[PDB]
């Protein structure tokens, strides 16, 4: 029939006015036990309580009434976290014990600095190793945090820091504040970051996001992690202290995320008290949405306490100044362990009796589920109900895509048509002259070499085919087999036919002012160019090379900047090596026109080809003299170097060989 007083500290406003009902809840749990006889033969556990508001000052006052003018106590049951953090340091000038049911400030695990403190609400560190998972999942690496600067959190966040430095994640921003939360978010938006973690309380948060809408932080790339042990509607409620509406956060918070912890045993097993969560909840609703998820910890705590008291046995024969009873009961609790409503109710420093967590999303109006998780196995159960306005997670930075500047393939085909026509004409006149290859106005001009001429021109006319194309879906893997193809193809096409006529001209000075000396002269000529090539060609070959311009501002997508790069084969000494080569080749026709200036109105009647010969030669020479510096200089604009480039060649052939045999054709008649 003995009985012992207790005092204990609860909420009614502020950070967590949830134990409104826990107070009746523990009253229920209390009247549970004095009914039973295995509890205490003599003692009947009594209570005192006071409102605290989670304002430590008022709490300090009520505490003073509790000890100084209050009945003899031994043990205390507080609520929110700051308050415990206080009273633990406060205790040991009385040698008390204390236990909290709600508070998660991890720093309290320091058994040394805090000898006489016990928890059951796990240290909130478990929230974190959840989080990295998503950070490993959706490929996120750079972050900003804000926080209210109480002890409860700062250490939590410092724990975050290392628990991702194991995975090399970066942190690149922090902030802080006490009650004027306005400015650091304004600081954030001007550091442009996409991700947010928050770690704070309700009556801060309403103010926070109220301000946040007035700087437009939501929607596509403004993701927020928060905390889950708020109410389910916290933001909807009247704020008498801002200039905001409802709908603005009803639209602005959209997309955000929460995490919290499962407390009960989710299973279905008879308790020690012949109870289970189902009938538990029924009783709570019977005794009377907000402040409910968290109560059971009492209905574990005090049971554990009284079990300590069955273990231990004078009790009313107590003093603060004594020290021995505390050590007794403290060893008791160090040893204390069993299974109860929440689960394997046992104490340690890791605060990790539990393992099972909860994820939660919000999708337009209220809170919903996505999956669950357990950390011991890194096992993640999912449900596939997510949403993003966009349909996939954004990524903390506008990522750069390195495309290529295409070559406008829609136009390639046109000049390709021109190429085919030139080919037709080439082979036409080819088989033409060789067919009717017996006459005096036909055979007395050596048209074999003219056939060669058209042939080389056909080769360089093919020169559209290889080199007009890289920057579309053409090769992407093996350029060099086609890259170098411009080179071999060129002179084999170009210089040959070009010199094919030159030989003809060579006699008009060298002879008039045979055709094995001649043919081998051409062999010497071509092979001269070719060996002077190969010394640089097969020794110093080229390769596909990439170049890039300045970064740009695309603005043709959701959010990603464009960094174009270009490509074309070149070696490191293409400054003068390549233009002086062009010059070497050009000197030939420079002298060719000198020979023209000689051989005007000097027919000699042997070979019937001088007149428009020189004309065509001039026509070519100017085109080369032009196109070399122009394709050289105008390379960085790859898009239309090709524009002049081969048109020249086309407007060579299509206005070179065309002239060659048309009068000869008309010579038939």
């Amino acid at each position: 029939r003995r009985a012992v007083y207790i005092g204990a500290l609860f909420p009614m406003s502020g950070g967590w006015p949830g134990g409104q009902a826990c107070q009746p809840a523990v009253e229920m749990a209390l009247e549970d036990v004095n009914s039973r006889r295995d509890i205490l033969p003599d003692y009947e556990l009594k209570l005192i309580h006071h409102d605290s508001k989670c304002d430590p000052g008022q709490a300090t006052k009520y505490l003073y009434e509790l000890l100084y003018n209050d009945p003899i106590k031994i043990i205390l049951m507080p609520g929110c976290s700051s308050v415990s953090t206080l009273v633990a340091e406060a205790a040991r000038m009385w040698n008390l014990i204390v236990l909290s049911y709600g508070s998660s400030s991890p720093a309290l695990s320091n058994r040394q600095r805090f000898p006489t403190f016990f928890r059951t609400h796990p240290s909130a560190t478990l929230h974190n190793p959840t989080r990295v998972k998503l950070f490993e999942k959706w490929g996120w690496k750079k972050i900003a945090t804000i926080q209210q600067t109480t002890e409860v959190f700062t250490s939590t966040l410092d724990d975050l820091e290392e628990r991702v430095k194991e995975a090399g994640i970066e942190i690149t921003f922090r902030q802080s504040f006490f009650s004027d939360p306005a400015v650091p978010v304004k600081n954030l938006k001007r550091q442009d970051a996409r991700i947010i973690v928050g770690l704070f309380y309700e009556t801060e948060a309403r103010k926070v996001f109220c301000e946040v809408y007035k700087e437009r932080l939501f929607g596509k790339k403004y993701v927020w992690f928060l905390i889950g042990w708020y109410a389910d509607n916290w933001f909807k409620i009247y704020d008498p202290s801002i200039n905001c509406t409802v709908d603005e956060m009803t639209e602005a918070v959209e997309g955000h995320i929460t995490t919290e912890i499962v407390m009960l045993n989710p299973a279905n097993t008879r308790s020690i008290s012949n109870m289970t969560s189902q009938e538990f909840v029924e009783k709570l609703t019977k005794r009377l949405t907000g402040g409910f998820q968290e109560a059971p910890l009492a209905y574990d705590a005090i049971w554990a306490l009284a079990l300590a008291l069955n273990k231990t046995s004078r009790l009313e024969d107590f003093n603060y100044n004594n020290q021995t009873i505390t050590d007794q009961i403290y060893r008791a609790m160090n040893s204390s362990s069993f299974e109860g409503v929440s689960g394997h109710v046992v104490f340690d420093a890791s605060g990790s009796r539990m393992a099972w967590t909860l994820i939660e999303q919000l999708q337009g109006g209220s809170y919903k589920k996505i999956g669950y998780y357990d950390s011991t196995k890194d096992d993640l159960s999912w449900s596939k109900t997510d949403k993003w306005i966009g349909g996939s997670p954004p990524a903390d930075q506008t990522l750069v895509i390195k495309t290529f500047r295409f070559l406008s393939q829609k136009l390639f085909i046109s000049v390709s048509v021109l190429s085919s026509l030139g080919i037709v004409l080439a082979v036409v006149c080819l088989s033409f002259n060789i067919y009717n290859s017996h006459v005096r106005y036909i055979q007395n001009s050596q048209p074999n070499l003219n056939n060669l001429t058209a042939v080389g021109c056909s080769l360089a006319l093919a020169a559209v085919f290889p080199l007009g194309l890289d920057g579309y879906h053409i090769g992407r893997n093996q350029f060099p087999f086609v890259c170098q193809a411009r080179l071999w193809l060129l002179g084999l096409g170009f210089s040959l036919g070009y010199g094919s006529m030159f030989t003809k001209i060579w006699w008009v000075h060298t002879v008039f002012t045979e055709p094995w000396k001649l043919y081998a002269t051409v062999g010497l000529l071509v092979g001269m160019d070719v060996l002077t090539l190969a010394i640089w060609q097969i020794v110093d070959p080229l390769h596909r090379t990439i170049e890039t311009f300045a970064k740009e501002e695309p603005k043709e997508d959701i959010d990603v900047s464009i960094l174009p790069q270009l490509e074309h084969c070149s070696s490191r000494k293409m400054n003068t090596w390549l233009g002086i080569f062009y010059g070497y080749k050009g000197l030939l026709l420079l002298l060719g026109i000198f020979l023209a200036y000689e051989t005007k109105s000097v027919s000699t009647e042997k070979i019937n080809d001088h007149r428009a010969v020189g004309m065509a030669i001039y026509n070519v020479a100017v085109l080369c003299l032009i196109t070399a510096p122009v394709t050289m200089i105008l390379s960085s604009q790859q898009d239309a170097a090709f524009a002049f480039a081969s048109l020249a060649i086309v407007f060579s052939s299509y206005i070179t060989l065309v002239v060659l045999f048309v009068p000869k054709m008309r010579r038939l008649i």
Binding site: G57, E89, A91, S179
Partner: protein, 681 residues
């Protein structure tokens, strides 16, 4: 004092000498009792007298808190509490007072967070937090006109709050806050992000032991010289530095530290009738071998405050009963605490620290600016803030350079200019072909009467070469900008810069066309016919000219590059600038004229296809004309394209436009009229 109670003081501080802060616990007191003895010798509070009950705190919150409770229960009704030095205890006590109708005052709350009366209403203090330095800093910046900053802190309550006030005070004060970072323990992953902006200024609001790591990474990124000035608090322990010794000692030297001032600098009569020098003499005589304080005279000022504000309080209408209800007060007269607070909200007077007054709670006070002058610290100036002032003294400060390190960059404009000699080289070549033109004039006009003169009325050809010269000296007008130009009439020339070209080419290319047209139309007034032809051609000329010149036709448009320039070797920035001009709409007014002249070519080439079946060799050389025409045709079109596709690099835009024209005009005309000298010779 037997008539009255000893009026309450509840004194809280270190008392032992086990803790270093224990220093302060006794390093201040004797001046406190000194003032007590003064007011004993004066006895203002007649009929009343004062006293204090001292207790221990030890800055382990348990002991001090229990001690507080202890002085409550086992003592009289107290009214006012003095002390609170360690932060954690005062940040506790602050909120517990609203429940007992108290007020407190102390002399160490640098912990700024206490400003929120809505949280911690009944608190007061004398010493200025780190919060009330920012005004000074602002004014400093104004007085040097530094106007760009790179903030930096480290994430804890006591500094982050400073930052989150500074951001709030510079609203409407014409300076920006560009960059920002923060860090917990490892700073260096930030300073280089900051160096990436090359900014010239540092604020730093961070605790002691981290400066090592700070500057150890600074040197490894080398921020020091003149261009980098720094601001730090000054409350560090002097000689605080004991990765590299010399590296720092060379690097750091020349920063600014800043903090609260200990004392004034001026020996004016006080409230007591005394002076600073008197105060410190009384101090050092009052002690023998105890460490010296710095937050003591502030304390003394506060005690005088307590006195005079008490006197303000008891000056009350109902002094009859209140002069006893002092005594029977039972911790609960809410009205009383309201009375006291309303009283002290407007207390105001002088002491060792100048005047001392309150704003929401906080002192208006006095400030020490210091600089680190070659292995020691020295005062540099002073900032009274209540009058929003400043005082700085020459021959005291120093920079490593001499000038105020400007805060942005070596921004420079550097209007580009094409071709130093290109105004000269090719222009002289033009003068060469020009003198050849005049040579042809001389040796042409000489003969004027001969078998060749009748082959062609050479005044037509004189007109041709006239347009030749005109077209041909057009070039220098493109040799214009950069040097020899600031007049802004660039648009004026460009009108001419096309007018000339158009006319010269037009006329001097129609002339021989018409020569041979006449030869044909006679063969298959004579000269004024062709003046009529070109007076009609004027209509095309001027009509297109002015249609282009509808509004202006020429808008001097300065185009800006990426501002990506750093090649001076002078630590500067030159935003590359260039010019251009269009009808301020689109480039359509040009293919018109190119087509108009291609039509001249083609219909003129009707004569060409005639000549291809004319039996040419009678009197003239349209053969000499055709090569010219094909040549110039292709060349002009190339120039036209390549120009507009490269309005960008002008360095060549002026070259190639020259080479086209010079080849055209010269190696057409000259080596065409040469035959007309072969003939004579």
């Amino acid at each position: 004092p037997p008539s009255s109670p000893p009026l309450s003081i509840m004194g809280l501080m270190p008392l032992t000498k086990e803790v270093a802060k224990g220093s302060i616990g006794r390093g201040v007191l004797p001046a406190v009792e000194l003032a007590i003895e003064q007011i004993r010798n004066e006895s203002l509070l007649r009929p009343y007298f004062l006293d204090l009950r001292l207790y221990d705190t030890e800055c382990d919150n348990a002991k001090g808190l229990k001690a507080f409770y202890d002085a409550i229960k086992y003592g009289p009704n107290h009214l006012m509490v003095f002390g609170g030095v360690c932060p954690s205890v005062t940040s506790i006590i602050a909120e517990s007072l609203q429940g007992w109708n108290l007020v407190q005052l102390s002399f160490a709350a640098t912990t700024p967070v206490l400003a929120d009366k809505k949280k911690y209403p009944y608190f007061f203090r004398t010493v200025p937090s780190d919060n009330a330095v920012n005004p000074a800093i602002l004014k400093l910046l104004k007085h040097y006109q530094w106007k760009r900053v790179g903030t930096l802190t480290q994430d804890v309550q006591r500094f982050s709050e400073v930052r989150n006030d500074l951001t709030g005070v510079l609203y409407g004060e014409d300076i920006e806050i560009s960059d920002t970072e923060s860090f917990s323990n490892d700073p260096c992953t930030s300073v280089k992000k900051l160096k990436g902006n090359d900014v010239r200024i540092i604020l730093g609001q961070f605790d002691q032991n981290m400066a090592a790591k700070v500057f150890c990474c600074a040197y490894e990124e080398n921020m020091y010289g003149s261009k980098y000035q720094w601001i730090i608090p000054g409350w560090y322990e002097p000689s605080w530095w004991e990765c590299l010794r010399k590296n720092l000692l060379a690097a750091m030297e020349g920063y600014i530290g800043v903090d609260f001032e200990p004392l004034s600098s001026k020996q004016i009569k006080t409230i007591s009738g005394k002076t600073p020098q008197q105060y410190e003499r009384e101090y050092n005589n009052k002690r023998s071998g105890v460490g010296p304080s710095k937050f003591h005279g502030y304390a003394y000022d506060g005690i005088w405050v307590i006195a005079k504000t008490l006197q303000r309080a008891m000056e009350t209408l109902h002094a009859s009963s209140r002069h006893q209800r002092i005594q029977d007060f039972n911790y609960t007269d809410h009205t009383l605490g309201r009375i006291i607070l309303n009283a002290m909200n407007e207390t105001n007077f002088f002491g060792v620290t100048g005047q001392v007054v309150f704003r929401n709670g906080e002192r208006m006070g006095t400030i020490k600016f210091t600089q680190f002058q070659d292995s020691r610290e020295v005062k540099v100036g002073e900032y009274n803030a209540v009058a929003d002032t400043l005082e700085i003294i020459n021959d005291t400060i120093r920079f490593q350079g001499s000038e105020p390190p400007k805060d942005k960059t070596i921004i420079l404009e550097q209007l580009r200019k094409i071709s130093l000699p290109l105004y000269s080289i090719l222009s002289a070549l033009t003068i060469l072909g020009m003198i050849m033109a005049s040579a042809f004039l001389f040796f042409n006009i000489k003969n004027r009467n001969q078998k060749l003169i009748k082959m062609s009325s050479p005044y037509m050809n004189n007109l041709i070469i006239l347009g030749g010269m005109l077209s041909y000296a057009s070039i220098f007008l493109f040799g214009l900008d950069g040097s020899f130009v600031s007049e802004k009439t660039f648009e004026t020339l460009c009108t001419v810069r096309t007018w000339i070209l158009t006319v010269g080419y037009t006329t001097a290319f129609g002339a021989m066309f018409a020569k041979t047209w006449r030869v044909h139309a006679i063969f298959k007034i004579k000269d004024q016919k062709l003046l009529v032809i070109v007076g009609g051609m004027l209509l095309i000329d001027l009509c297109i000219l002015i249609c282009w010149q509808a509004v202006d036709p020429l808008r001097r448009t300065v185009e800006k590059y990426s501002m990506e320039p750093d090649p001076a070797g002078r630590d500067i920035s030159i935003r590359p600038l260039l010019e251009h001009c269009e009808n301020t709409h689109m480039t359509i007014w040009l293919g018109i004229v190119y087509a108009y002249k291609g039509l001249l070519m083609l219909f003129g080439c009707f004569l060409a296809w005639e000549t291809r079946n004319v039996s040419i060799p009678a009197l003239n050389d349209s053969k000499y004309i055709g090569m010219s025409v094909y040549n110039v045709g292709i060349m002009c079109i190339i120039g036209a394209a390549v120009s507009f596709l490269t309005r960008d690099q002008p360095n060549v835009q002026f070259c190639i436009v020259a080479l086209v024209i010079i080849f055209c005009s010269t190696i057409t005309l000259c080596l065409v009229f040469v035959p007309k000298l072969i003939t004579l010779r």
